[PDB]
Amino acid sequence: LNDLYRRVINRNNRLKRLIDLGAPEIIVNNEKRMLQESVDALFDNGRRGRPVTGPGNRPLKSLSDLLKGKQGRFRQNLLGKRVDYSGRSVIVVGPQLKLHQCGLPKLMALELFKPFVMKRLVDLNHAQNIKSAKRMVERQRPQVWDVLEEVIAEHPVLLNRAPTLHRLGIQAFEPMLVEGKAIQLHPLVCEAFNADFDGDQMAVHLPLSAEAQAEARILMLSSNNILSPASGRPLAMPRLDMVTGLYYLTTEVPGDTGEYQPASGDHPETGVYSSPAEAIMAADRGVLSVRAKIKVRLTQLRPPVEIEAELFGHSGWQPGDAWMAETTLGRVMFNELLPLGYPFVNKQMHKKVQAAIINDLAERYPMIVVAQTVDKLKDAGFYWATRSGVTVSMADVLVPPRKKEILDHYEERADKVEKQFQRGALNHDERNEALVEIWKEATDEVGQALREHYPDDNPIITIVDSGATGNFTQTRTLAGMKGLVTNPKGEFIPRPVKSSFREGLTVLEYFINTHGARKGLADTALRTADSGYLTRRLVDVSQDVIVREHDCQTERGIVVELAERAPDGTLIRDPYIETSAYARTLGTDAVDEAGNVIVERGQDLGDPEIDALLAAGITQVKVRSVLTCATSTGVCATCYGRSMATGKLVDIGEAVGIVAAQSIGEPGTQLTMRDITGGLPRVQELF
Amino acid sequence: LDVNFFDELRIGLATAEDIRQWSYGEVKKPETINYRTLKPEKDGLFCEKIFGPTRDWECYCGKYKRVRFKGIICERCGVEVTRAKVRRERMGHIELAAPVTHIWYF
Amino acid sequence: RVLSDGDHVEVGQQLMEGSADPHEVLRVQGPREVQIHLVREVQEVYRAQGVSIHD
Amino acid sequence: SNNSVPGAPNRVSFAKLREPLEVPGLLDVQTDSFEWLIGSPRWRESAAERGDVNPVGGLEEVLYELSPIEDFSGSMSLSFSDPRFDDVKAPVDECKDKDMTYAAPLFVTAEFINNNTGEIKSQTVFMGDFPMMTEKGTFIINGTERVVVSQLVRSPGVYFDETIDKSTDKTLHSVKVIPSRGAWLEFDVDKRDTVGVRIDRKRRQPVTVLLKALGWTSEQIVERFGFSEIMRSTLEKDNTVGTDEALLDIYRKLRPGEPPTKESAQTLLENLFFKEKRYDLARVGRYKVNKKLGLHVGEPITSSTLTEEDVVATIEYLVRLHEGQTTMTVPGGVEVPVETDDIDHFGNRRLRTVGELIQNQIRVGMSRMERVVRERMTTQDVEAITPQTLINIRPVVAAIKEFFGTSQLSQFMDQNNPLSGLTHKRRLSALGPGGLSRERAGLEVRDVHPSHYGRMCPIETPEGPNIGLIGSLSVYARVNPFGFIETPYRKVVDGVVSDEIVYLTADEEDRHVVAQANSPIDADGRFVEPRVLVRRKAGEVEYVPSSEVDYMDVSPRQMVSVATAMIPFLEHDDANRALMGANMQRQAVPLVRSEAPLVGTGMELRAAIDAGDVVVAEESGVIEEVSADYITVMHDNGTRRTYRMRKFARSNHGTCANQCPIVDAGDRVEAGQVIADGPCTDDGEMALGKNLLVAIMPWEGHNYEDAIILSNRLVEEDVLTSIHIEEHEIDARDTKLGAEEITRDIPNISDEVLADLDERGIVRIGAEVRDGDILVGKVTPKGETELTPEERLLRAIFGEKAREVRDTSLKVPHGESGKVIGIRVFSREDEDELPAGVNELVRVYVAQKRKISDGDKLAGRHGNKGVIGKILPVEDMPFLADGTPVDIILNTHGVPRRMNIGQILETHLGWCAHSGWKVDAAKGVPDWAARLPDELLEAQPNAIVSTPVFDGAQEAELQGLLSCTLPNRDGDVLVDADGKAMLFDGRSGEPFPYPVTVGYMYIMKLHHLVDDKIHARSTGPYSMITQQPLGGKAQFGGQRFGEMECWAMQAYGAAYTLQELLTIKSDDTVGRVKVYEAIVKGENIPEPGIPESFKVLLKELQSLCLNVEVLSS
Amino acid sequence: ITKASLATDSWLSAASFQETTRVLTDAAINCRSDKLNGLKENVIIGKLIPAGTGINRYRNIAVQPTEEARAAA
RNA sequence: AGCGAGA
Ligand SMILES: [Mg+2]
Ligand SMILES: [Zn+2]
Ligand SMILES: [Zn+2]
């Protein structure tokens, strides 16, 4: 930049000399034009004419280029800065940690805390003065480890994982020392970061001020953020391994050892047990399987609603009362992990059911209990997943025995279409579509055959159908037939692939296959770029939507349909009710058959309320929303509705705008597509 | 310096009067630093007489060199003896022989 | 019933297939209808891939 | 019989097919091109074998096109001839050591002629030190190893395209004549029925205007072009009569602002197109125009410049295409089918190899040199000039230097392991000078093209923001003399599949029909079946016309590169995971021991030998004497030769380059035999990893989400460990104040801290050191510094030397430690070739032996990567019924949905290999074993095998082998038929309720070690123009709290912590010391100030004549 | 959304957003004054955001023990 | 400034 200034000064001085000496109009005019061009280049080089070039034939960074673009001063140095007192390392799963904890290697902690540890070891007189203490730490003298354990204690730390797609990308944990160089993360928060242990690098930041430490300890604590700010579904829920372990634990297998049998005339039922403890002690022996139907006399787990209402009815104090439960021992061992007050569930623990349980638990019980229960659940899940006996082997991947007959049956139709085309019956496009349809049908048929061929206890069906991970399309591709493969333009190859990966794809089938995978990988990058830009836009527009008032008392509101009247006469719950009317404040009192009010104005409209409205037979309800909010600045608490994350009404300072925008942007990328747009471009167009 | 009294921020066109009011001098030579002794030139693009002393608390020639001479200007070289960091604060200005038009508005 | 020639239409029924520009619907039906339109469309595109975002 | 080389480990293979052709010389892509550039006798003979009409080297070509040259008047001329190379000025190892570039002098015989009188003055001119290629195929530049990767670029010529016009829904056609450094005319057709030139990207024309500019008449235009209606249309719409008028309009439009004249218009067009000065199509370009338009198919090629014949034929082709004709016949030219062209089709994507790149750079330097010469000729006194004083060589040497250094296609060699170095060669990058950049590159260049089959690997590709632009050559691919990529195919006539192999380019394959390799043959050279799989022109894998398929694929695995060709059971892996596995085969670190895989591929050997990290006997003989450092072998005729090993030399990426002999003192060794292996080689086979006993159980959540748990045995027995060498450099420069000095003369140095240091200020050799320890003791002259009275009083309290010379000594960077392998003292005092200014440059080599630990990244060969969650004691490990503890435990949940069960198959096969088997052929062979090759019904324990990529172990064969798994030591088969065994829990002790898949997997230690990733920062250097401390672990990384992190922070409503971060952690220059003081002394953290970046913004806006003021209120 | 953002009454935020040169030229010609009320602005100049723990009801809470606590002393 | 690479 300095050189540009030199150019300006040279030309100005030469102009001054030219006016002084007395020069022809032509020369002095040209010099004036040159001065104009120099000032132009200085303020903005390259805007008019070719940019002034420097050594190496590159434009000079003009005084304005400092300000614009990604690398301008605004979006590299002002709003985004590098910061001291920070670290970074690879992450390794640690299941032994509590939800509010994270491992932190000794060297990294020592360095990060070097000021504090210096202070403590000077206070402890292990060193005479500050500089002697600094020498003490720089050589890691043996005495400086105990003091380090003293200082780190009760000092929260934030763990970011770039990119921070949403609010839960950065959470505060209580750090704990670990031996070797690797931040030991808690598994249950993996989803919140979307951080999966194959070489992700998670940065660490250290709050200092009392306000910052309070903020990290209170607002940001990992155990304080369970429910998503977007849709409120639990994000610390067990998954992958834990969910499989629990599914194995709580499922029931008829005909197992130690089952219940009510046979009489020769012996008693021989299926009942005095207490759950007895059941575990029997399971230790090779007598009772953990997945057998039995009858246990429970005296410490609350019965479900109907049994409570029958045996006790009014005020059943379960901690002492006893009741006969006909379930599996595994389900009992599960139900001990839930709080005392939660009723007995007695259901197979699909991931869906786990999510429902955690949602209800968070709605009712205080958050700390939710954290403790989730952690116990993780422990049991890992243990029983280890015992679950889920492993993959070629022998466990069973191809369908009817595959060849279906292949012949559908290849016959394919040959028929080939013959019809060879006689000119139809053009290339028509026969391509005909083959596409025939082979898609074949696809569905072999998929059905494979599904019905598998038993239920197979490792692959067990993992997929428990909700743990993966979808049946992947299973069908694994055994059976992969299917139609995408043309690199995007169309469907009418070949198609007819081979299972277990059977092993042929050379040409593989070559055809590569098109789709390469295109998918390419499509990921541009789409995440556009998603990031969209999020930037939405954030800026909503950078000033924050709560200001509790209530504006505005009569205005919107109407939401809820259930639609059936033609036969019935209320079927509208499918998309969980994202429309939930977590909303009623604008007007509900009315039933011109009767009393089921739920009057100003109620959160949580699950019982919607159930009551559906039962009573009302569909349209007027709810308050941000749209019809009377308050000029920002919005009010009531009109906005319930905070999805906190589970209660919003505070008077929440920046709901940023939360909104980030929640819109977060499902980017995972928002895929299959001319009117229908993907992320369509969203962009709408906004 | 600066305080929390930032209640309002204003931007506007800067007239030549304002520009020469900001400036602590008027650079009139295209000389950065001496090739040999590696020091700023007089009236150059790094002139110590304008933007302050390179190393804090002494004038160019060195007549005054310590803190008690704070806010004093040495007669020999004219350097105001103060903190060096002010070099990030003080501006110059070039008095153009002929008027020029700012590109942004063109 | 499929919309066909000779049929009495509404003030908002999409005549043809495909989307409609939000300026037009605003000018026809005021702010509320365009609001409901925009929210419905964005929610649809998100729901089409199975991601749940509260309205 | 693999044969291949004399020394051969008997790795039996599961291959059914027999390769007709051995895998070519994988490094040929570079060495052959460079030999062509030189004009070496080897290249001369090779070209003679296949086109002896015109053997001319790249240099020779440049000189020929350059020579002769004349001035403006033509009174004298200068010419070049006879390029030649002297012996290299130094051997490879020395050139590597002392930084000097492994180069040889280049000589050209000049010849200066004076036309007025008649003389010829000739003498060699010494163009400069050309950089040469070592035998391994890499250049040595400034001591480092550099490789010129091949570039993929669109070939020149005539390309026709058609697009619909949504405005009218009509198919409009356009053509691009793409030259090498030319003009870019285009005959574009718009929706309006008028064909029009767009000459040099300038505002369109009617074609008839141009035609009349060449000298055509309206009747002639009707004669040649009248058949189409658009041509008549544009004729009438032209409203432009007269050749003078046409040339006037064109000249007015081409170079406006200059005075139109009827003399400098013909020259304009003729120079612009029909002169080689500005419009060289090159040889490939002119060949393609001739073939596509069929003008000079019979004639050899020369004079790349065009002819009006060319352009008029182009317009004719375009108009016929718009009409919808199938074929056109030019008068005097073969008929060619009228069709639109592609762009990505490898008949248009050509390879600029090393030879072409260096030749282009030479040509650029030669153009500059000729410009300098031509300029000075006006001022050259006649008869007082000779070539030697006439030729200035500096621009040429400068151009070659600035090429080999900082040119994009001259990349720093990547010797992570022999495979990584090998795969960096054969790497085709689509980006660079004259190529598509990542940003401007679309999404359609990145995808596979059906023409890629056999010429470029669809699998191997970077996963980052580069996928598609960079790929790898197929194994059998061979580069066309014109720069295209040829592939081998067996020709079959009358269904007789002979061994006659022919190399076909993309276009030639497109014309013909090619079968598939694994199409069974009846052993008579004929197809044992009807319905033989086939590919066709448009890239569609379609149903087949049985018989009369003109060609076939030399073998399976023809479409895969060297890296991905080493993945056993590749056909069972999805493209994504195979891509990753190929990528990760290039990140494995060389282990201390290295063990060949039990389960591999035939390529484990060829890759090792062609990687050129392995010593091969040049000629047969008997090993006379072998030692750890050298091997002296007595050849069969008197002479003896000594190969000196390379011991613990540092590679370009800090890895070890150790070589050790494998031949005893009595062995006789034939030529082409391996005599000393390398980093990742074991008895000649590439061994990147280790064979470990593996289980597939989810174990207590420690192997959660592709996290890996290891036996401590792997640490104790030291089966996973890497040597890492890092060099630290320090120079005694000269300053105005004085000069630095490298010696024990240091200020304020403790006795101990100076103990390690030798008298010369160099740490003692082979000494253990730690972060911060003085590697080399250096002190810089302090000049003059104003001291502090408090320091003066202190110095008096101690009554010691105040001292002046400032202390700046080479110290171990933070987080490093190890042994001092070597110290090199290159000094100006020793008269070393130090760069101007440094008086003594010392390099210290520090090596550390890194063992496996949490955070390190392992992975198999099927994209099954992961960091190590934990390393359990061997006792609490699942151990088989026999008491053998497993080594690793991967997670089951990762297998199905990642769709890479190849690993599982490998696992099974690995166990079968480790245990050894014996097929019970008591009553004939079992049906499933009928097709198994002989010598596979039996295999001793720990017998290595190979499954070729697309022709290997069929799952039925795996089942059968897994059934017969002869017992380990006593009578007990630990793994059942299914491949799963019963495993005892190490911790509880009870056996696991269900059997668990157990086997042997070949996994690797990837070069992403945690020690190089861990980093921390409390306070350190800060950037210059702004604060916000310096980023990067290299300096002292301050972790970027970017924008999305600010958003997340706001969303929590967490405001004070945000302000703290962005103000006093990052920028605020006054608060920062204050918070440090508060922390040290235990006071409340002060109030944040204004970040120092806002003020720089204020000053910059003010500097733009924008009066910005902060009003108080 | 873009237009709505660029129509805010804060030039320091619009400039931070996009198309810097034009927005600054416009704001300069209008002698526009930014009141520093949004979030991006408060971030840029490094004072406390007016959201969450930064608004004027929590930012200035007065905290003291109870008279019973003073009695405990 | 340029290269290559991880997530
Ligand atoms: Mg990852
Ligand atoms: Zn409201
Ligand atoms: Zn002075």
Author numbering:
A (entry chain D): 340 to 1013, 1023 to 1035
B (entry chain D): 2 to 107
C (entry chain D): 1097 to 1151
D (entry chain C): 28 to 1140
E (entry chain D): 1210 to 1282
Paper text:
RNA polymerase (RNAP) is the central enzyme in transcription. In bacteria, the core enzyme (subunit composition α2ββ‘ω) catalyzes all templated RNA synthesis. Promoter-specific initiation is directed by a dissociable promoter-specificity subunit, the σ factor, which must bind to core, forming the holoenzyme (holo). Here, we present seven distinct intermediates showing the structural details of M. tuberculosis RNA polymerase initial transcribing complexes and promoter escape, using a de novo cryo-electron microscopy approach.
Within RNAP, a conserved, two-stranded β-hairpin called the β‘-lid projects from the clamp and interacts with the β-flap at its distal end, creating a protein tunnel that encloses the σ-finger (an extended linker connecting σ3 and σ4). Nevertheless, σ release during promoter escape indicates that a gap must open between the lid and the β-flap for the σ-finger to escape. Cryo-EM density for the lid is absent in this class, suggesting significant conformational dynamics in this structural motif. By contrast, the density of surrounding structural elements remains clearly resolved. Although σ remains bound in this class, the loss of lid density coincides with RNA extension past 6 nucleotides, consistent with a conformation in which nascent RNA collides with the σ-finger and initiates lid displacement. This structure thus represents a state poised for σ release, which is captured in the following intermediate, where σ is no longer present (TEC-Backtracked). We hypothesize that these lid dynamics create a path for the σ-finger to slip out from the RNAP cleft, allowing σ release, but only transiently during a short window of opportunity as the RNA transcript extends. Therefore, although the lid adopts a default conformation, it is capable of movement during promoter escape. Along with biochemical data, our structures also show that the β‘ lid, a conserved motif, must rearrange to allow the displacement of the σ-finger.
